[PDB]
Design a protein around this ligand. Structure first.
Ligand SMILES: O=P(O)(O)OC[C@H]1O[C@](O)(COP(=O)(O)O)[C@@H](O)[C@@H]1O
Ligand SMILES: O=P(O)(O)OC[C@H]1O[C@](O)(COP(=O)(O)O)[C@@H](O)[C@@H]1O
Ligand SMILES: O=P(O)(O)OC[C@H]1O[C@](O)(COP(=O)(O)O)[C@@H](O)[C@@H]1O
Ligand SMILES: O=P(O)(O)OC[C@H]1O[C@](O)(COP(=O)(O)O)[C@@H](O)[C@@H]1O
Ligand SMILES: [Mg+2]
Ligand SMILES: [Mg+2]
Lengths: 274, 107, 518, 514, 518
């Protein structure tokens, strides 16, 4: 990929026994992981795939790195407009395991019901997201995450804590590279993370992370930086209102930084929706 | 009563399971990203517009099959469909493009 | 480096997941019950012998189809296959017989006078629903007869009707006196005598039909172990089945199938009235939105685990194995997650009744169950079961939780339980030990009914009652030691937990012993 | 190697205990409030200067004894001592003044004092006064009119801080026929307790009224209200304080069985609670006091309301320069229980070693604060705290979470009324809460809350509000640096609001120390 | 609304605290062992009879003071008082004798020839310390003689010297040979033969002095149950005591007293080498800063609980009761917290040896212990003990944990344990049940030594050995049933847990029974 592709995310597909055995070193070198269950289920005994899936999702959640669950999730939908009960289960459990992304292959590439397959993944994901036991999940993520001096990590954990306490309709994050929004996603809030960015690649790459709902701000740069920041916050308020994530008077969490540029997110505000 | 909030408040995982409720509706927001492999069923601009509306976040291109010309056209169609919604910035959804390599294989 | 013991030691559920290891092999013991639907793919004595060898524990008879004569022959063949192994008591496996009722089903009639004919339905087309018996054997693309005379009373304009496992969907646009004008929403191929669902509707059909009455009476005559009662909506439905079984069938287990919105809403009263529950995902996934079925499954498994009542996960678990010798990744996942959820029993339907690979389906359920059982986070599971279980004066309950505790402490190869009615073994099962529960009984019904509970590996002792009671007890303990050694559950020198009582009879289990395998 | 951080990382409370380390030194910051009773051992300006230096945060004035003139002079001396440090605002420590009411006492007869008591005998108790002038083991009279409506045959009666026991054998009428259960030194006009009885004396006596009015005149920070039995008692004190004393904190003293039973309604009506173990340990069996102490601390922590542990904490220090091992244990366990403040009575009022007593409370508190198992404490506080829309509550919990994640040297909070700082304190961070205020009363009242280290900003109001906010943040940075809480480059949590005025704290910043 | 059962059921420790209830009365059974120092206030047969009735379990003899003749008489009186109750074996309470060594103490001389003569020392004043035995009897306001020859070689200039339980402090102003010159920082009433502490200094006195040898020898002759070894610094100190006791004292329990920095630092090796630990707070609180004592107390109790070794909390627990009939609130708190921390035993020193209210002190420890035992959060305690205790193949461990689990489940009135050496009962005590552990033994030393463990209520069976072993076992179980009934621990119909073994002799406990009280 070279210097020219240095910002392209590398997702390593784990496809065989070696990839599973050398998982930690692969994870550290990658931007994220795909649980490539198709080949994996040929490479290792089929009855062991759920072990490798839950191991990799767990380790990725622990690392704060995107994990994709892939292959045969709604396979019967290639030919039928409804999934089997095993398929509905599989989708729901991938989300409950903690997968950032779910995938469709033949269901959308060649099948008779691509839109029904997409819609079904949407319906299941959202049902499964409400069924997450956040109380245990957030306790465990906190207990297992290193104490660091990183102000952004501390702000991002503060934001998720606050979002649970006030039952917020969203966490609004201004981000240039996506990193601040990724850091929130790692702590798995219930509320959507509205990531406001002017970077179109950032907006696209943010879909790798659970709960990151990216919004691409097109509005021109306001004169006062504080006003340009407030403009982007207000943009996210407008998106949330339009999408029905929240209404006027509801509280949201807002993450910003103390100066322009990447790497300065250190401000968390609990704000009413105007 | 909404988004399994009764289950949310349980002191044990077992009680959490006991409280899962088919009559507790989810919130509007969906957090899990949806990746769709694009191929002949899903390649047209018109189908891709509906894929996006239905919740597609990432368009996967599988490089086991197809020419660069074929893939370049798919990518063009993805971008055409995506940008048809650019007129309203409030409602515009970003759509990513993923390249899935053939990798080392046997044929 | 065996049975996910590294994952077992984790302080968090998240770390437990991180530690799951594809190179950590399971124990030999498989705890989850395997229920197989018997049909033409699986009915011969010879096939049934292989089913049993492959891990079948319960033979399900589906009373939607077939005569009493057909069912009596299947039952006979099940018993023939089972008893062919009676020659070695150490290796003999008890096999239960389950009767699954038809219940308040709705079905269409014949496409153009044929059982196999199909027509296509296109999106947007008018299809007329008739109850005129003239069109009983004359269904087609334009006129569909179905067998529910009150359909028009319970449906309205804008109602959805689902035909054939909810694959075909209709919208009532126009309603007549004894007919319905519908528009095909989801089209496809329509064949004969397909299942019909009315998810919106309060369906007026009896809990226990006249056919269900005759079927249940036949079950008593045939000495069946359990009834899977279809479409249970309320406790009074369970009581109707119970009354029909009567004094003569009082020991037959009633498993209520939850397959509608009503069954879910009234779950608690149904559970209290039943011996256990089936999560009947087939109909359930048509009656309620498909994306909600996992919610209802995990709610019912959880509540059953909490009540210590058997729960079956059923339907489409390895569906693609009807046609293919290997399952899809969703199917592998589904089986593993039903186990991890807490299900006592997993089930096969079309996979064993009519498919091309019945033995492979059975084998696959066996393989997955055992892998998933090692992946259970017992540390949390046992803590939560204890915290949620009432303190009682019952000596057996106290002995059982103590035995389970002890089994975790010494990493025992088994819990051996002498039991007459099964209750003492059931009480152990409720606390979910890692180790198999070898339930030693002389009661053949007890041995068969024990497959309803996770971990209970029943052994039927056929040695005669030895005069000194202490010797008779030791004989049965030694029998279990021999079974466990032969099945490779444990070896000489390993420690096992042994549960007995202080006097013969029933209701006296109060003794827990930690014993070396001789 | 510091602050019990090894014990902090334990997965179980048992392993946490196993890891407690005498060679792991505490941080500089001490979070538990120290309340000192002022009396003849501690009343001089010069002694009070040392009291403050040694760590006294609150001067308690006991209104059981002494005139308004005496009390006015003590208050004047407290203020003289406190303000002698005002010259350096960075180092100045605010000092609160608490008025502890006399409350509804029951009293006896006269001696023209320690007489002989017939262990067994009988004593005639009437309300008309018959053996008024002489108190001998024979005949004794009382001031409590409604004695017979609240005590039955077989209800016990304590005399002289529980010293003399007596069981009621006959009513009543005005008369009471008794047996003697304990032998001791019978005084004159001595203290009477009625264990188990719901006493119907006024919550606010005529004396209490004059005292409470005097408190308002003297600008006291808080009232420690004696013998609170019910919510209506608290409302009475509140009404007596009136508009003029509307900002004075009411701390209800839990002194008997009724107060414990009606605890929830009392707590809801009060600003905080004192576990008044002295009277409580007479009214209820002594072996039950720890139950009521841990119940009340727990409920207060759950409510986020200040709780004071009081009475005999370092009792032997009245006569000795070191405490007993039971006393060191008691102080440490009150802190571990969750108490916001610890108190000194006779140890500072009348003892031979007041400064050593103060010093000892400060040393123990700080050792015990490092030994807290924050990991469990913070999980439990957050699980049990209501979800609300309140932005400051959400900000405060968020700040506490971030303080744990970056191991911050402090949580800096700008506060007008103290509420924002109180809201942080409720979640029990390890790091000190530097509460920056221009309100001198707020600075004094902040000592009621665990961890709140108040700093009184004297700097004038800058015209640009943003500059005035930054000025106060920088002031706190200077205090924290000077006190050795943190150094340049360390991270701290900073809490501010979106606009001037109380009620708008919604902003949490992770900031480096400049 | 009894035994804090509402608080018992709380999901959090914080809620558990919120639910503690002064109106919730404790059971009857008191689990925490009570150790009383015997001296002039308490050594009469008549007072000792009342100490036993009031709850004294262990009689501590402090060998800092008194002759062998004096101690022999005390021990004789303890035995006279104990044996006056032997007439009823059901009500007889075993009473242990503990020898507490002098150890490497430093003591002052006599004030002006007398052992009760007292100078009042002035603050700021000068005091000369000498090792010149000319002054050993002639101690006054300006001359103080110490018995530590090597004083000068270990104490530098500026060093702190503490006299009389640290109440008097002196600063090394002038350092010489054979003597020192100090100023009194903390003045006060200096008496005769008062303890001296050198917290800075590496004190080079022997672990086991020649006096300690004479004393331990005497202990062997007097058939003491246990030794409280003062000033243990290291494992080789424990090994020394063990070698001194020799073959003749091989069954005497060694309790290492932790009372200086080095002993805290070397805690793990000391614990491993000892039979248990005393938290000797008196010296410890002078040797290390007073404000650190609670840290060392909770560390040691925790590590002992984890090891399953007895831990004693000692010193000043009810100190004010020497002069007053009621304790201070700090003292009530201290007792309750030592129990809540997990101490097996609490101790009285001057409160029983020389105080005005020895029986009131004993009674108070009994009342507080029992209140605090109900306030234990057993849910967390038992979960943590399980999680932290190694999985082993040991059948007795597995049985003991099974037992405690069972006892929680059925809210049993007791755990009855037949034991020869005490070990099976010790193994149950390790897991901290709420219910008393009635340890039935024929071994009188076992019965006495069992008071070292929380919850073990030993009963000495006197009944002769029955020919049939099964009958002899049942006889001992029934004996324990009779004790429990008589003491009001339980009544007919209640359930109890019973632990026995499969054959006679130590090391075979493997049987747990849930039995109704006859
Ligand atoms: O997530 P990233 O890439 O670190 O970006 C977050 C940055 O965005 C901001 O909020 C706004 O920065 P810009 O105004 O430069 O876009 C910064 O204060 C903060 O450091
Ligand atoms: O589980 P159940 O039906 O109560 O049976 C357990 C019973 O089995 C026994 O272990 C053996 O009884 P039998 O000798 O009658 O077979 C009894 O002691 C015990 O009460
Ligand atoms: O704790 P309180 O009393 O609510 O005060 C906090 C207030 O202090 C501030 O940070 C500063 O307010 P002032 O400028 O009025 O002093 C406000 O933004 C915030 O609302
Ligand atoms: O605790 P210990 O010393 O191992 O003793 C327990 C022993 O006591 C018994 O219950 C009875 O043994 P005895 O009959 O020899 O006293 C044994 O079965 C068991 O092994
Ligand atoms: Mg069905
Ligand atoms: Mg000592």
């Amino acid at each position: 990929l070279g210097e020219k592709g240095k910002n392209i995310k590398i997702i390593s597909k784990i496809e065989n026994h070696e990839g599973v055995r050398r998982f930690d070193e692969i994870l550290e070198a990658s931007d994220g992981i795909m649980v490539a269950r198709g080949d994996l289920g040929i490479e290792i005994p089929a009855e062991k795939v759920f072990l490798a899936q839950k191991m990799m999702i767990g380790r990725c959640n622990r690392a704060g790195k995107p994990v994709i669950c892939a292959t045969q999730m709604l396979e019967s939908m290639i030919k039928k407009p409804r999934p089997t009960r095993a398929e509905g289960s599989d989708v729901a459990n991938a989300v409950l395991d903690g997968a950032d992304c779910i995938m469709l292959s033949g269901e959308t590439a060649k099948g008779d019901y691509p839109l029904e397959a997409v819609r079904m993944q949407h319906l299941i994901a959202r049902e499964a997201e409400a069924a997450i036991y956040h109380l245990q999940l957030f306790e465990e993520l906190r207990r297992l995450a290193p104490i660091t001096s990183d102000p952004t990590e501390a702000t991002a954990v503060g934001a998720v804590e606050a979002s649970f306490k006030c039952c917020s309709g969203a966490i609004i994050v201004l981000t240039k590279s996506g990193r601040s929004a990724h850091q929130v996603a790692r702590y798995r809030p219930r509320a959507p993370i509205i990531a406001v960015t002017r970077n179109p690649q950032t907006a696209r790459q943010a879909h790798l992370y659970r709960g990151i709902f990216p919004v691409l701000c097109k509005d021109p740069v306001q004169e006062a930086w504080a006003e340009d920041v407030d403009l982007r916050v207000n943009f996210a308020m407008n998106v949330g209102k339009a999408r029905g994530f929240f209404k006027k008077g509801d509280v949201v969490i807002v993450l910003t930084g103390w100066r322009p540029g990447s790497g300065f997110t250190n401000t968390m505000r609990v704000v009413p929706v105007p | 009563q909404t988004q399994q909030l009764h289950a949310a408040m349980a002191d044990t995982f077992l009680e959490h399971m006991c409280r899962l409720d088919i009559d507790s509706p989810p919130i509007t927001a969906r957090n899990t990203g949806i990746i769709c492999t694009i191929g002949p069923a899903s390649r047209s601009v018109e189908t891709l517009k509906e894929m996006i509306k239905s919740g597609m976040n990432v368009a996967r291109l599988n490089f086991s099959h197809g020419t660069h010309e074929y893939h370049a056209e798919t990518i063009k169609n993805v971008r055409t469909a995506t940008e048809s919604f650019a007129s309203d910035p409030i409602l515009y959804r970003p759509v990513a493009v993923a390249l899935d390599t053939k990798g080392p294989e046997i044929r | 480096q065996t049975q996910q013991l590294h994952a077992a030691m984790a302080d968090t559920f998240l770390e437990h997941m991180c530690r799951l290891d594809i190179d950590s092999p399971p124990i030999t013991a498989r705890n989850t019950g395997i229920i197989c639907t018997i049909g033409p793919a699986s009915r011969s004595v010879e096939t049934l012998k292989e089913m049993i060898k492959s891990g079948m524990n319960v033979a399900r008879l589906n009373f939607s189809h077939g005569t009493h004569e057909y069912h009596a022959e299947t039952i006979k063949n099940v018993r023939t296959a089972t008893e062919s192994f009676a020659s070695d008591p150490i290796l003999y496996r008890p096999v239960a017989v389950a009767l699954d009722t038809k219940g308040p089903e709705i079905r269409t009639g014949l496409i153009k006078g044929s059982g196999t004919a199909e027509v296509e339905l296109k999106k947007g087309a008018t299809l007329k629903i008739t109850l005129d018996n003239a069109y009983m054997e004359k269904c087609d693309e334009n006129i569909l007869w179905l067998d529910y005379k009150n359909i028009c009373k319970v449906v309205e304009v804008g109602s959805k009707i689902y035909v054939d496992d909810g694959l075909i969907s209709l919208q009532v646009k126009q309603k007549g006196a004894d007919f319905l004008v519908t528009e095909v929403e989801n089209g496809g191929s329509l064949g004969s005598k397909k299942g019909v669902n009315l998810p919106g509707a309060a369906v007026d059909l009896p809990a226990v039909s006249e056919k269900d009455i005759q079927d249940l009476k036949f079950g008593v005559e045939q000495d069946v172990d359990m009834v899977f009662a279809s479409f249970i909506r309320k406790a009074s439905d369970v009581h109707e089945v119970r009354k029909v079984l009567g004094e003569k069938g009082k020991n037959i287990k009633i498993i209520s199938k939850i397959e509608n919105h009503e069954g879910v809403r009234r779950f608690d009263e149904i559970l209290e009235a039943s011996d256990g529950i089936m999560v009947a995902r087939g109909d359930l996934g048509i009656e309620i939105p498909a994306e909600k079925v996992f919610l209802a499954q995990k709610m019912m498994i959880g509540r059953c685990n909490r009540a210590g009542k058997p729960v079956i996960c059923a339907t489409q678990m390895l569906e693609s194995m009807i046609k293919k010798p290997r399952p899809t990744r969703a199917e592998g996942s589904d089986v593993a997650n039903a186990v991890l959820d807490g299900a006592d029993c997993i089930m096969l339907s079309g996979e064993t009744a009519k498919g091309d690979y019945p033995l492979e389906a059975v084998r696959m359920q066996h393989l997955i169950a055992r892998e998933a059982e090692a992946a259970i986070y017992h540390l949390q599971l046992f803590e939560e079961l204890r915290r949620l279980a009432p303190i009682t004066s019952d000596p057996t309950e106290a002995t059982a939780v103590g035995a389970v505790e002890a089994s975790f402490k010494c990493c025992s190869g088994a819990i051996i339980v002498l039991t007459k009615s099964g209750r003492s073994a059931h009480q152990v099962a409720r606390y979910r030990p890692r180790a198999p529960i070898i339930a030693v009984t002389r009661n053949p019904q007890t041995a068969r009914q024990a497959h309803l509970y996770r971990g209970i590996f029943p052994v039927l002792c056929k040695d005669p009652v030895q005069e000194a009671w202490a010797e008779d007890v030791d004989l049965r303990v030694n029998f279990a030691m021999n079974v466990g050694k032969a099945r490779g559950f444990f070896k000489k020198g390993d420690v096992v937990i042994v549960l007995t009582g202080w006097r013969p009879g029933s209701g006296f289990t109060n003794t827990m012993r930690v014993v070396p395998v001789p």
